[PDB]
Amino acid sequence: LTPVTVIGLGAMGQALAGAFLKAGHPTTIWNRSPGKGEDLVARGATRAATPAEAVRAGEVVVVCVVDYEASQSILEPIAADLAGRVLVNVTSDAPERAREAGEWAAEHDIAYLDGAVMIPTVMIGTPDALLFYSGDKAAYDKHEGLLKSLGGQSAYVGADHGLAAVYDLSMLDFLFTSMSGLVHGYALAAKDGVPAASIAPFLKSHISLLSLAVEETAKNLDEGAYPGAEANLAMAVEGIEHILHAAERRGLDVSVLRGVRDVAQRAVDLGHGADSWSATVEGARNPA
């Protein structure tokens, strides 16, 4: 039963440590700020007094903090104590930061997986939870059972240390932008006296539509073909402008809709008014 260490006792670090304990792994925890995660110690975790003590207690060291400025500020002073252990950083950040961390790990003889948690804390430790990994495949295979205690959908995506961050940020781009639009549409409805509870059942239709659009948009963008006969971009721009101006008249922030509209109109300017929404990729890639 491989001993593991969790660096970071924010919401997600605590979830990761809890899943390791539930799976029966000896678990050691550490956080910059004191007093967090009381229940983890009640569940059997050892609380380390220093970062070096923490890493020396784990054959695998899992880091989950807010950014790589934070993670590397913790890890750089203790590089010598990471020798012979597998370092796994699941902090969400840019591929450039993951690649820099990977170069530093290689310099110090530290087996390295750079990863990402793609689901909320309550899903950690369940079969459906998705986590990405990239880097040392031998280390991933050796500790696959340990890692799968965090989520059944653990997905290794390649040896390049930035690849997990590519998949992570691309998906979060979609997710956060979508969550912004969800809040915004409910805010628009509320301005006109419609509670969100009345809109929510109908949005199931747009969730189903998004599932179809995931596949079609992927094929269109990979191909560079944007067939618009059944729904053209010029029509969509007019539709978006109606939303934009309605929300503006109601005193809502419309920075997001203005961006949606501007990127779409840019693609129209580039010749894509008869193409589908997928042609907006041309406006995103070729801004004015």
Ligand X SMILES: NC(=O)c1ccc[n+]([C@@H]2O[C@H](COP(=O)([O-])OP(=O)(O)OC[C@H]3O[C@@H](n4cnc5c(N)ncnc54)[C@H](OP(=O)(O)O)[C@@H]3O)[C@@H](O)[C@H]2O)c1
Residues that bind ligand X (CB under 6 A): 8-13, 31-33, 36, 64-66, 70, 73-74, 91-92, 117, 120-121, 230-232, 235, 239
Which residues fall in the annotated binding site for NADP(+)? 9-12, 31-33, 65-66, 92, 230, 232
DSSP string, 98-129: HHHHHHHHHHTT-EEEEEEE-S-GGGTTEEEE
**Per the structure block, which two tokens stand in for 51?**
């970062």
Nearest Cα residue to 147 out of 157, 156, 135, 159: 156
User: Is residue 266 at the binding interface for a copy of itself, with CB under 8 A as the rule?
Assistant: yes
Nearest approach, Cβ of 39 to a copy of itself (angstroms)?
12
Q: Which residue among 39, 103, 253, 269 contacts a copy of itself (CB under 8 A)?
A: 253
Q: Which residue among 23, 52, 189, 270 contacts a copy of itself (CB under 8 A)?
A: 189
CB count within 10 Å of CB 287 equals 8
80 binds, among ligand X, a copy of itself, none (CB under 5 to 8 A by kind): none
Longest dimension (CA), the chain: 64
Q: What part of residues 202-231 is at the interface with a copy of itself (CB under 8 A)?
A: 202-211, 213-215, 217-219, 221-222, 229-231
Task: Spell out the SS3 assignment of 11-75.
Answer: HHHHHHHHHHHHCCCCEEEECCCCCCCHHHHHCCCEECCCHHHHHHCCCEEEECCCCHHHHHHHH
Q: What part of residues 79-138 is at the interface with a copy of itself (CB under 8 A)?
A: 92-96, 118-122, 128, 130, 132
Q: Which residue among 67, 76, 103, 109 contacts a copy of itself (CB under 8 A)?
A: 67
